[PDB]
Amino acid sequence: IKSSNEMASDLIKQLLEDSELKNKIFNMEEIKNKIDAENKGPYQNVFLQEIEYMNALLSEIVKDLEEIGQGLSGLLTVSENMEMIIESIALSRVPASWQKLAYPSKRGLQSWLANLFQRIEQLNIFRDDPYSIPRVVMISRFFNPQSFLTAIMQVISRAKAYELNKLYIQTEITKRSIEEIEGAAKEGAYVYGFILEGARWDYQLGQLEESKPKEMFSVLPVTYCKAIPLPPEGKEDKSLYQCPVYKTEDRGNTYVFTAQLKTRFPPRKWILAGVAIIMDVEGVSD
Amino acid sequence: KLAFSEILESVINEDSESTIPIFFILSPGSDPVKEVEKIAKKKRIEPGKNFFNIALGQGQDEIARRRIEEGNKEGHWVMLQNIHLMPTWLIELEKILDSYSGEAGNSEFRLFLSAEPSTGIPIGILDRSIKLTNEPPAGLKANMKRAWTYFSKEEIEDKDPKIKSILFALCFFHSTLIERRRFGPKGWNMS
Numbered sequence A: 001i002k003s004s005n006e007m008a009s010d011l012i013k014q015l016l017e018d019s020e021l022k023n024k025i026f027n028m029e030e031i032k033n034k035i036d037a038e039n040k041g042p043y044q045n046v047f048l049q050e051i052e053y054m055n056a057l058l059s060e061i062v063k064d065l066e067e068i069g070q071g072l073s074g075l076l077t078v079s080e081n082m083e084m085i086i087e088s089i090a091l092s093r094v095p096a097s098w099q100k101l102a103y104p105s106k107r108g109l110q111s112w113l114a115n116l117f118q119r120i121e122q123l124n125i126f127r128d129d130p131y132s133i134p135r136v137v138m139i140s141r142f143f144n145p146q147s148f149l150t151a152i153m154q155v156i157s158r159a160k161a162y163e164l165n166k167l168y169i170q171t172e173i174t175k176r177s178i179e180e181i182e183g184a185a186k187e188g189a190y191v192y193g194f195i196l197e198g199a200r201w202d203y204q205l206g207q208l209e210e211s212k213p214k215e216m217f218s219v220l221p222v223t224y225c226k227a228i229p230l231p232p233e234g235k236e237d238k239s240l241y242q243c244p245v246y247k248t249e250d251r252g253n254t255y256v257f258t259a260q261l262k263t264r265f266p267p268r269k270w271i272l273a274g275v276a277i278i279m280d281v282e283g284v285s286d
Numbered sequence B: 001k002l003a004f005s006e007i008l009e010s011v012i013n014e015d016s017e018s019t020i021p022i023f024f025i026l027s028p029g030s031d032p033v034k035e036v037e038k039i040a041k042k043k044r045i046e047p048g049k050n051f052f053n054i055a056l057g058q059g060q061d062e063i064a065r066r067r068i069e070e071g072n073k074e075g076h077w078v079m080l081q082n083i084h085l086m087p088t089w090l091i092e093l094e095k096i097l098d099s100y101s102g103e104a105g106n107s108e109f110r111l112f113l114s115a116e117p118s119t120g121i122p123i124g125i126l127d128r129s130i131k132l133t134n135e136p137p138a139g140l141k142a143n144m145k146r147a148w149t150y151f152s153k154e155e156i157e158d159k160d161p162k163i164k165s166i167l168f169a170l171c172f173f174h175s176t177l178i179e180r181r182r183f184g185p186k187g188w189n190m191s
Helices: A004-016 A028-034 A042-073 A078-089 A097-098 A109-127 A145-159 A267-272 B003-016 B032-043 B063-075 B087-103 B125-129 B142-151 B154-157 B161-180 B184-188
Strands: A167-171 A189-190 A195-197 A217-219 A223-229 A244-246 A256-258 A277-278 B022-025 B052-055 B078-081 B111-115 B131-132
Touching: A004 A109, A028 A042, A042 A078, A042 A097, A042 A109, A078 A097, A097 B063, A097 B078, A145 A167, A145 A189, A145 A256, A145 B161, A167 A195, A217 B184, A244 B052, B003 B032, B032 B052, B032 B078, B052 B063, B052 B154, B063 B078, B063 B087, B078 B184
Parallel strands: A244 A277, B022 B111, B022 B131, B052 B078, B078 B111
Antiparallel strands: A167 A223, A189 A223, A195 A217, A195 A277, A244 A256
């Protein structure tokens, strides 16, 4: 006597209506009015774009959930795409309609929802005091993390009188945890949520090293993503290895940007070992 | 323990009498025609005149139609290959085999047919048939061994010690690309 597909949805419906989703929906006008629009920096614009994408996702899941919840209990014509959402919810796959909105990350439905609330909770600490940016940003939990990396270069193009184009993003990996308080020191935004697969970052040495036999993913500590001008000529550095970051474990056309991290070994070693950073692994604490 | 030649020998002999055509689903780097010709020669004395290893190409579809028609009433088996190449003629072939199931028409006739695994093969032909995959052994060694085997002994022996050394390294390079595929993201990133 195992719970039917249409019961398994009603349960997830109740968990998502016991959680204040319709409240979690952002109100664009209220947040825009809190911003003066004279002192509005680049960061502010990127978040406002993120909460719009989120508010467009969060509306879509609440609508498709209250529509199937209405269609389950109450008398209503059962749409073809609604049965497809019920079926997918029984399997514990994320639905196709929901997946198309927001981030491309591959998680189980209960993990997806738990991650979605950490996305919301990164924006619920923006809403309160927008002008004051969080000291350590969580690049893991954006929609376009790429759009946030343009933003950090924008802030340095105001401070220093040279072209935004000529800046590339440099990634210094820090020995400090999220304990540290010195918030957004000149030239960079501190960052967390980078997860290195294929190798192991040593903390004490501060260098890329060989992966521990059983431990598959070594989570990187806080990353002081600097902006700095490009080199004059095409130069190759042995010390640094140019590891690409990807939004998901899949690593297929989810390339955000190339990072640079210290290696005593030859770089050729690491490109062959398939070394890359990743945002979402399902090895993210709490 | 049965390798492949002994499997095909067993499944041709024990079953596949007639009306049940013997299907060969093949992967790149596989030849069904050599194995069937060997097994064909042990059971019956075949000079490749009694039985025909007809290759399906545009225009030769009408010759295959005459060969399969001649085969039934005579009692000699017709090997077709690269079946997938004509999707139109397979809907025509299905209609011929349906006619010969009720007719039933010399015994000790067979239809060996070999296709590449593709969509747009008719259901009716695949259903009735005895299907048999001969997949080549996967592995760095088995894939490096196949890389040499490919190059004609006579060509490489003649070539000087320098060039055959750099060919050996290139065979391994070609092998280690195919063997990387196996690991999903951490491997290639693209098929």
